[PDB]
Structure formats: structure tokens, C-alpha cells
């Protein structure tokens, strides 16, 4: 099926306590495989998945060099944002960045990404045409003029349509034992009385990969939408994910409620009933 590759970087300044802290992480689908921490001792792009440790030291020299350069660029980009927003030099600010590509079931390029965020809000983002930028405020429009004059999107597109797609196909191959196997969710249901006239039904989904899943409660075939407590999908810690959905029901009316599980690894969507 379709697959994705993403890098997420974060630079947090700390005036008076040294250089800004830079952290970057790389993902294939919902599987992290590399990391870089500017405060770690190695000062190297470190591996985080088994299928990437087979890469030679030439790969690690190349990736360590590119991520170190990004770290220093975000260091001077944090100073620039201070001038743009007229902010003081004592405050701690955040510069975040995401870039990557999406490939189809065959490996063809579908979409590419290249986005910046300052202090948690959108700054600039490469549009779907891989040529123009979405400037989110007056400060980003200064950056949009600079980058569109220096044709920044052209080199960034060459990576997205080429180096990103090639590396993603190469990663999916080396780790096909993990990256390309979908684990369907193991489901169960629990029952908790809260008073003598109400009770809780909790619908569990455990040990599934990839993370995308949909849990829905129904009363007499009608979606609940509201009245349904839904938690964020959470990592189990072993590469699989968890999620549960709970509904509060009047006592004696348990069987009129159903839970519906949709997942990639399910041949048919499940329906659960107490």
C-alpha cells in the first residue's frame, strides 16, 4: 500500500544557557529509525531501528553532516525571527520543521512536504505545486519573497521527488519484515458499573500497526459521536499501538450498544457487542 517518510526537527533557544537545543527524528510510516540530539555525546545521526544499522559509515557521515548544517541554520533562523517579530533576546523560542514525501503502492511520488513553525504556529509551507510558499503572516512573507527569488523550492523539490522517494523505497526493502507487515488489532470489551442505574462499556484495540484506526460506538445502529470518550492513539512501546473508546450506558441497556473497529490489517471491520 501507500507509505510515507517524515523528518521532524525542533530547535529551542535558551539565552544564557548555551546554543539552542536541536533535536531531529526520522520516521517511515509510524516507525522511527534515526535521531539526532545536539546535546548528546556522539554528535552523530544515530540509528533507532534494526533495519537501518546495516548502513555503512559513509551513510552516517552524510546524514550527520546534513543534520548538523540544518542545526546551525535553525540557530541563525532563531535570531532572524527575533528581528522579524521584535522579540527580546532573553526569551526562549521554538523553531519546528517537517519535511518528507508520500509514495504509492507502486513507489511513485504522491506528495512532498517542507514546512516551518515558529512558537507552535504556522510560518511558511511549501504548497502542493512544489514551487510556491504559503506565508502565514507578515514575517513569513519576508521569507516567501527571499525564497521565491532564490528559487529555494526547486532544490527542495528535487529532493522530494528524487532522494526522498529513493531512500523510502530503499528503507521499505531493508525493513520489509517490519515496515510492510500490518498487525490487526486485538479487541476486547470491559464492563464497569458506576451507579446502580448506569455502567461503562470500554472497547479496546491493542497491538496494531500501522497506527491509523477508527473506533466508533453505536446505539441501536446510530453513531454516538458525542457521549463517547475517545483517547488519542498511544504507543504500546513495542512498535504497536493502542486505543480505547468508552460509553456510559443505562443499566440493562448494554446489548443495544455496539463498537466498530476499522483497521488496515482487518479483512472485514469488526463489530463488538457486550
Amino acid at each position: 500500500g501507500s507509505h510515507s517518510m517524515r523528518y521532524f526537527s525542533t530547535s529551542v533557544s535558551r539565552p544564557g544557557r548555551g546554543e539552542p537545543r536541536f533535536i531531529a527524528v526520522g520516521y517511515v510510516d509510524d516507525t522511527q529509525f534515526v535521531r539526532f540530539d545536539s546535546d548528546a555525546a556522539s554528535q552523530r545521526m544515530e540509528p533507532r531501528a534494526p533495519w537501518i544499522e546495516q548502513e555503512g559509515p559513509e551513510y552516517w557521515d552524510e546524514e550527520t553532516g546534513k543534520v548538523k548544517a540544518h542545526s546551525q541554520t535553525d540557530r541563525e533562523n532563531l535570531r532572524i525571527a527575533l528581528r522579524y517579530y521584535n522579540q527580546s533576546e532573553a526569551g526562549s523560542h521554538t523553531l519546528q520543521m517537517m519535511f518528507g514525501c508520500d509514495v504509492g503502492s507502486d513507489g511513485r511520488f504522491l506528495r512532498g512536504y517542507h514546512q516551518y513553525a515558529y512558537d507552535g504556529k504556522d510560518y511558511i509551507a511549501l504548497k502542493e505545486d512544489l514551487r510556491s510558499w504559503t506565508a502565514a503572516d507578515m514575517a513569513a512573507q519576508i521569507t516567501k519573497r527571499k525564497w521565491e527569488a532564490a528559487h529555494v523550492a526547486e532544490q527542495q523539490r528535487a529532493y522530494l521527488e528524487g532522494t526522498c522517494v529513493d531512500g523510502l523505497r530503499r528503507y521499505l526493502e531493508n525493513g520489509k519484515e517490519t515496515l510492510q507487515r500490518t498487525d490487526p488489532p486485538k479487541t476486547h470489551m470491559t464492563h464497569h458499573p458506576i451507579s446502580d442505574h448506569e455502567a461503562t462499556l470500554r472497547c479496546w484495540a491493542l497491538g496494531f500497526y500501522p497506527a491509523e484506526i477508527t473506533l466508533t460506538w453505536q446505539r441501536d445502529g446510530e453513531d454516538q459521536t458525542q457521549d463517547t470518550e475517545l483517547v488519542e492513539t498511544r504507543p504500546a512501546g513495542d512498535g504497536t499501538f493502542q486505543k480505547w473508546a468508552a460509553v456510559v450506558v443505562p443499566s440493562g441497556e448494554e446489548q443495544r450498544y455496539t463498537c466498530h473497529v476499522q483497521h488496515e490489517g482487518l479483512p472485514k471491520p469488526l463489530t463488538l457487542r457486550w
Binding site: 517518510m5 523528518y7 526537527s9 531531529a24 526520522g26 545521526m45 552524510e62 546524514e63 546534513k66 543534520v67 548544517a69 540544518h70 541554520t73 535553525d74 541563525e76 533562523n77 532572524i80 525571527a81 522579524y84 520543521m97 519535511f99 516551518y116 510560518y123 514575517a139 519576508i142 521569507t143 527571499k146 525564497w147 532564490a150 529555494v152 532544490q155 527542495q156 529532493y159 532522494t163 526522498c164 529513493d166 531512500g167 523510502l168 528503507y171
Partner: peptide
């Protein structure tokens, strides 16, 4: 497969 992020704001 990291890219070249040397563009300044």
C-alpha cells in the same frame, strides 16, 4: 535520507 536545510528566514 536528510535534505539540505541551509535556507535562512
Amino acid at each position: 535520507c536528510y535534505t539540505w536545510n541551509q535556507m535562512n528566514l
